[PDB]
Amino acid sequence: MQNRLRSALALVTGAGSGIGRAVSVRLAGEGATVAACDLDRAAAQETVRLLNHAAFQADVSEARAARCLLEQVQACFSRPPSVVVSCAGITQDEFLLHMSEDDWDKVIAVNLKGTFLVTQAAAQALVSNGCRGSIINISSIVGKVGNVGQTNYAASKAGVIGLTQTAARELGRHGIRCNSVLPGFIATPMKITEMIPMGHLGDPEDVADVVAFLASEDSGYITGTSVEVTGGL
Amino acid sequence: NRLRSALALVTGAGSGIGRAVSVRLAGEGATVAACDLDRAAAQETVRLLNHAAFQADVSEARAARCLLEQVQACFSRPPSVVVSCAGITQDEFLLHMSEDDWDKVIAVNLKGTFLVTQAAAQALVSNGCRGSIINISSIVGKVGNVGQTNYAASKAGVIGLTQTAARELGRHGIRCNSVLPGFIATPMTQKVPQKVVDKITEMIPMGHLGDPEDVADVVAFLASEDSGYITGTSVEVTGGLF
Amino acid sequence: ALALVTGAGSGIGRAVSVRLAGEGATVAACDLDRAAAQETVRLLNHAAFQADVSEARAARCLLEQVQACFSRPPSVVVSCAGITQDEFLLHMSEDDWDKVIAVNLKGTFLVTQAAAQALVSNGCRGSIINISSIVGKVGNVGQTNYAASKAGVIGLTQTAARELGRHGIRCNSVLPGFIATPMTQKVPQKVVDKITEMIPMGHLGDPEDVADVVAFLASEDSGYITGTSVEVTGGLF
Amino acid sequence: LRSALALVTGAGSGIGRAVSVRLAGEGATVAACDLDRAAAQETVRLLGNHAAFQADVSEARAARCLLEQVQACFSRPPSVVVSCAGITQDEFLLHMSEDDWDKVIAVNLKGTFLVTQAAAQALVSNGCRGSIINISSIVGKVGNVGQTNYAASKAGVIGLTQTAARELGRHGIRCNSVLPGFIATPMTQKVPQKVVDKITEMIPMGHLGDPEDVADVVAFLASEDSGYITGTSVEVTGGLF
Numbered sequence: 001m002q003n004r005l006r007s008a009l010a011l012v013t014g015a016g017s018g019i020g021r022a023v024s025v026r027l028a029g030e031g032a033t034v035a036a037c038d039l040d041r042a043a044a045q046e047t048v049r050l051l052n053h054a055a056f057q058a059d060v061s062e063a064r065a066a067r068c069l070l071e072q073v074q075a076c077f078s079r080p081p082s083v084v085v086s087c088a089g090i091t092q093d094e095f096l097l098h099m100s101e102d103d104w105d106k107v108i109a110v111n112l113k114g115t116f117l118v119t120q121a122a123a124q125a126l127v128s129n130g131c132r133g134s135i136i137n138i139s140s141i142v143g144k145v146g147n148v149g150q151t152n153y154a155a156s157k158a159g160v161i162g163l164t165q166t167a168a169r170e171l172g173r174h175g176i177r178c179n180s181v182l183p184g185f186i187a188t189p190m191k192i193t194e195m196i197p198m199g200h201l202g203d204p205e206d207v208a209d210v211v212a213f214l215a216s217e218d219s220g221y222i223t224g225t226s227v228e229v230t231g232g233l
Numbered sequence: 234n235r236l237r238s239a240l241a242l243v244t245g246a247g248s249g250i251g252r253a254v255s256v257r258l259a260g261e262g263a264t265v266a267a268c269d270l271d272r273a274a275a276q277e278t279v280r281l282l283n284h285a286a287f288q289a290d291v292s293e294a295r296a297a298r299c300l301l302e303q304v305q306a307c308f309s310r311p312p313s314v315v316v317s318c319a320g321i322t323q324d325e326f327l328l329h330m331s332e333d334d335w336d337k338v339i340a341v342n343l344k345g346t347f348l349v350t351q352a353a354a355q356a357l358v359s360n361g362c363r364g365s366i367i368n369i370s371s372i373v374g375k376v377g378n379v380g381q382t383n384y385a386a387s388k389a390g391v392i393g394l395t396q397t398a399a400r401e402l403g404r405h406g407i408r409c410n411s412v413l414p415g416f417i418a419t420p421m422t423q424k425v426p427q428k429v430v431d432k433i434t435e436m437i438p439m440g441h442l443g444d445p446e447d448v449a450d451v452v453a454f455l456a457s458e459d460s461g462y463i464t465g466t467s468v469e470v471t472g473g474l475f
Numbered sequence: 476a477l478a479l480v481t482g483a484g485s486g487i488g489r490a491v492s493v494r495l496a497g498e499g500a501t502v503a504a505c506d507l508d509r510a511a512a513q514e515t516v517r518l519l520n521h522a523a524f525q526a527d528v529s530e531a532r533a534a535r536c537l538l539e540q541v542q543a544c545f546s547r548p549p550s551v552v553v554s555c556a557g558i559t560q561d562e563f564l565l566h567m568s569e570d571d572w573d574k575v576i577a578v579n580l581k582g583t584f585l586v587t588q589a590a591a592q593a594l595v596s597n598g599c600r601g602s603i604i605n606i607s608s609i610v611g612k613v614g615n616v617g618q619t620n621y622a623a624s625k626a627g628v629i630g631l632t633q634t635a636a637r638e639l640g641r642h643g644i645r646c647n648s649v650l651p652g653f654i655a656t657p658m659t660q661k662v663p664q665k666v667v668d669k670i671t672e673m674i675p676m677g678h679l680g681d682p683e684d685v686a687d688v689v690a691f692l693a694s695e696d697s698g699y700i701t702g703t704s705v706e707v708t709g710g711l712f
Numbered sequence: 713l714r715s716a717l718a719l720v721t722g723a724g725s726g727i728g729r730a731v732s733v734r735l736a737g738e739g740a741t742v743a744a745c746d747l748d749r750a751a752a753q754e755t756v757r758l759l760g761n762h763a764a765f766q767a768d769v770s771e772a773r774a775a776r777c778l779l780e781q782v783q784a785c786f787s788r789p790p791s792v793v794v795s796c797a798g799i800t801q802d803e804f805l806l807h808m809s810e811d812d813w814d815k816v817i818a819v820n821l822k823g824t825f826l827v828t829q830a831a832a833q834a835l836v837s838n839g840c841r842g843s844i845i846n847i848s849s850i851v852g853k854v855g856n857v858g859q860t861n862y863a864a865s866k867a868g869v870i871g872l873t874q875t876a877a878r879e880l881g882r883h884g885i886r887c888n889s890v891l892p893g894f895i896a897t898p899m900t901q902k903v904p905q906k907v908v909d910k911i912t913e914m915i916p917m918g919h920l921g922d923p924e925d926v927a928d929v930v931a932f933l934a935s936e937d938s939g940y941i942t943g944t945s946v947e948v949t950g951g952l953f
């Protein structure tokens with residue numbers, strides 16, 4: 001750990017568990033004030049207790065909720081977040097031959113639309129206030145290579161990568177960087193290790209270390225790319 | 234006649250690439266079920282090619298299934314070639330993009346391609362039949378493009394969907410592949426102004442925009458047994474663009 | 476159509492010569508092994524050529540001899556010549572590295588250049604098709620040299636397409652997965668059983684499967700495809 | 713990186729010099745290696761007993777001797793190895809000499825292989841963990857007119873690095889590639905103004921990169937913050953499209 005974010009306000013979605021929680025703890029450790037957002041307000045509050053910081057409830061798949069989140073953060077802190085990390089994400093695995101419409105729609109709405117709506121609301125708040133920023137979207141190596149039983153998740157995560165590339169291209173002129181992180185097999189609540197050259201499963205803190213780099217000025221000429229954190233999977 | 238045996242279903246068949254695919258597949262001996270949101274345009278395509286026209290909104294779950302049922306009732310077999318060319322753009326900068334402009338593009342381009350891939354695979358597996366599913370993505374799905382966050386997202390999603398589908402369906406003898414066209418003159422792109430359309434042409438090694446026939450030719454290859462060991466991949470038809 | 480195929484004496488190169496000659500092409504079959512080439516020719520006026528593609532003079536002379544024999548340049552050129560010399564990075568001899576680079580990468584460069592030079596000076600259009608490997612995209616344990624040489628071919632081919640489109644010449648790479656040929660006879664059956672479980676199509680490729688894709692890329696059906704890679708792997712994951 | 717010994721090739725100029733400065737600033741001791749002895753030495757002056765080494769990395773004997781000299785000097789193999797030695801000899805494919813091709817392949821691709829190998833052998837024979845960082849280029853992914861040789865070599869470096877990472881993970885050694893875009897250095901000094909202002913229009917961030925931008929990524933890849941990253945490429949291009 002280092003201290004590269006002493007002036008940062010960081011908004012983290014899916015901050016209530018796993019990678020989101022590890023990200024919140026790491027960014028706070030670097031000096032950032034964290035706006036911890038989760039669908040489950042008590043999970044967001046618990047994260048805040050582990051890190052002034054504040055908890056927010058939001059369903060990021062909802063357009064109204066994504067906008068109101070950003071307005072609430074702005075109200076509370078008197079400024080927009082300069083670091084935004086979209087970690088809210090879900091799976092609902094099924095084989096393509098049997099995937100229900102709810103299986104598909106839910107995953108797309110949370111993982112893809114949600115990331116869209118947060119990127120957008122974040123960028124609007126930064127641009128309207130004349131501020132520089134770093135937006136980091138957690139995708140998955142599955143978005144690059146696919147995975148049996150996960151046609152919905154693979155599509156959503158590929159979509160996040162495509163979204164982030166385009167956002168980077170549009171927002172670079174405004175001083176706003178946009179990057180994707182592609183984790184492999186991470187031990188979280190969401191034979192394999194023979195397939196991992198590093199020889200073990202990843203920890204959520206392994207992803208948070210990369211997110212901290214991308215949130216910091218040490219990546220200030222990095223935008224529109226994806227960084228794989230998979231142990232060489 | 235590569236495709237003499239075959240029945241082919243083409244969505245978005247009323248226009249541009251879908252129409253050229255229909256013509257091309259019929260030229261190789263296939264019977265074509267030509268589907269479009271516009272029944273009239275589908276009927277027109279069928280006239281250029283017993284082939285039959287079908288009407289459907291592929292973004293709607295019950296319509297995608299009904300389309301496949303309708304074709305099976307008409308021809309007494311499932312289609313063994315299915316080409317998803319139903320697609321739209323609704324361009325806007327990220328900072329200004331409305332929820333409906335996001336939603337509509339994702340519904341038609343991504344959800345529609347999902348639902349058609351699914352219904353097709355289901356019809357084939359249930360009938361013990363081999364097949365080839367070909368989804369038209371875009372090179373913007375690989376690299377993004379300014380003003381098209383929604384489109385870029387949708388087309389990247391089509392590539393991940395197609396890769397995963399390929400992997401689940403190979404054991405059933407069904408191939409799934411994506412075609413990534415570059416800049417193709419169609420009614421989709423006919424509204425794009427010439428001062429930009431000119432500048433794009435300088436970034437094309439082949440020195441000109443593509444024809445729907447160029448995309449059709451790749452689709453016919455992926456439909457045929459000449460591509461029988463190709464699955465889960467994307468073929469770029471861009472003239473070397475970029 | 477006049478087609479030059481390097482590595483034509485065996486496996487993929489042989490199958491490509493057969494396929495293209497079946498489509499009406501006249502084939503110049505070239506191989507390090509002169510008897511291998513002649514036998515390819517006898518299996519298919521087609522003619523056999525001997526050359527070590529890794530050698531600059533040999534590559535230029537090959538394209539000289541083809542043009543003196545047919546009175547025109549080849550308008551389809553397929554670089555199938557290539558070797559493996561596998562070893563772990565920790566133990567890889569300089570020789571193991573240099574040979575694979577010389578044959579697979581420099582050889583493909585030399586032939587791509589010599590072919591392009593002949594086409595452009597003659598005012599002829601063409602399609603150059605370079606056989607890389609899926610390993611050039613994802614790498615493979617024991618094959619640091621091969622993976623580098625094959626990734627190299629992909630970079631060379633992308634750049635070559637960018638430079639040559641304006642002269643009516645297309646340049647593409649084919650990336651096969653596991654294809655049953657003499658190059659893969661050494662692979663243990665116990666390893667092949669494993670690999671096969673990871674091919675969604677459920678079987679190894681035949682050289683004919685690669686030849687089918689080369690014929691498409693040789694033909695004008697692929698006339699707006701340049702600077703790209705086509706994977707022929709059965710979905711190998 | 714207080715503990716660490718870093719070997720940087722191409723350390724006499726540009727990105728290699730920036731990386732040396734950056735690693736030193738984080739507490740590493742730097743073995744600064746260059747074809748030009750004088751340039752390596754000035755880097756050392758510009759910089760915990762840092763030392764200058766001369767080697768032509770494209771020669772197998774010079775790459776093994778380099779690592780032996782480093783180990784003899786420091787009693788330890790370098791645990792961070794950054795291959796920045798690299799050249800261009802640009803020409804159109806139709807006019808490109810055998811020498812222009814050969815030199816670029818030898819330095820950029822064979823040199824990176826030999827140094828990666830020598831570093832890995834030294835680390836493994838001593839039971840030590842490390843991080844090998846190879847500077848490739850965004851042109852290795854997408855190609856570039858007039859640089860058939862450079863593009864082949866940088867694509868080769870990516871393929872080399874992926875494979876190395878898969879073989880060496882089991883020994884505690886990471887291998888990653890850095891893909892810089894358009895960086896202001898003596899390599900790109902001869903690119904004319906008009907091409908540069910046009911290029912700048914292709915960069916979402918709206919300016920050229922600095923050798924320190926690249927050095928910052930290298931320090932990340934050298935540190936334990938990147939402990940679960942191996943066999944991948946990090947792009948530092950400002951969004952260059």
Ligand SMILES: NC(=O)c1ccc[n+]([C@@H]2O[C@H](COP(=O)([O-])OP(=O)(O)OC[C@H]3O[C@@H](n4cnc5c(N)ncnc54)[C@H](O)[C@@H]3O)[C@@H](O)[C@H]2O)c1
Nearest residue numbers: 014016017018019038039059060087088089140186188190
């Ligand atoms: N864990 C892995 O192996 C892995 C691998 C690759 C990618 N990822 C991705 O990383 C991100 C974090 O995953 P994780 O492993 O920490 O999962 P997790 O379940 O531990 O955390 C996800 C958090 O997202 C929150 N969330 C879900 N829907 C939400 C919504 N609509 N609005 C707000 N919050 C919502 C949940 O309450 C939960 O707190 C996700 O994008 C996930 O897909 C995880």
Ligand SMILES: NC(=O)c1ccc[n+]([C@@H]2O[C@H](COP(=O)([O-])OP(=O)(O)OC[C@H]3O[C@@H](n4cnc5c(N)ncnc54)[C@H](O)[C@@H]3O)[C@@H](O)[C@H]2O)c1
Nearest residue numbers: 245247248249250270290291318319320371414417419421
């Ligand atoms: N034209 C290009 O430059 C280009 C480039 C890359 C990718 N593509 C893709 O190629 C495919 C075909 O595009 P095109 O150029 O033929 O456009 P087009 O407008 O000429 O053809 C699209 C057809 O899709 C039909 N359609 C629209 N919504 C539908 C729905 N919900 N259900 C069923 N049919 C529907 C339309 O009625 C139309 O007939 C699309 O997926 C497009 O995104 C086009």
Ligand SMILES: NC(=O)c1ccc[n+]([C@@H]2O[C@H](COP(=O)([O-])OP(=O)(O)OC[C@H]3O[C@@H](n4cnc5c(N)ncnc54)[C@H](O)[C@@H]3O)[C@@H](O)[C@H]2O)c1
Nearest residue numbers: 482484485486487507527528555556557608651654656658
């Ligand atoms: N077989 C596979 O599984 C596989 C997979 C991916 C890629 N490839 C590639 O396909 C191409 C052909 O492979 P194959 O499987 O047909 O192998 P093969 O060994 O059957 O054929 C190779 C031919 O290359 C010729 N050759 C070797 N060096 C030469 C040189 N310097 N000059 C001229 N000719 C030379 C040999 O004499 C031989 O006839 C190679 O580039 C190979 O790397 C093969």
Ligand SMILES: NC(=O)c1ccc[n+]([C@@H]2O[C@H](COP(=O)([O-])OP(=O)(O)OC[C@H]3O[C@@H](n4cnc5c(N)ncnc54)[C@H](O)[C@@H]3O)[C@@H](O)[C@H]2O)c1
Nearest residue numbers: 722724725726727746747768769796797798849895897899
């Ligand atoms: N500058 C850019 O825009 C850019 C872009 C992409 C990639 N790169 C890569 O970054 C690395 C550093 O480039 P740079 O811009 O700092 O170049 P530079 O010319 O400033 O420095 C390269 C250094 O390598 C040394 N060198 C050359 N050949 C050598 C050899 N055989 N053995 C040992 N040392 C040798 C040179 O003398 C020089 O000191 C190179 O691999 C380059 O290709 C640079």
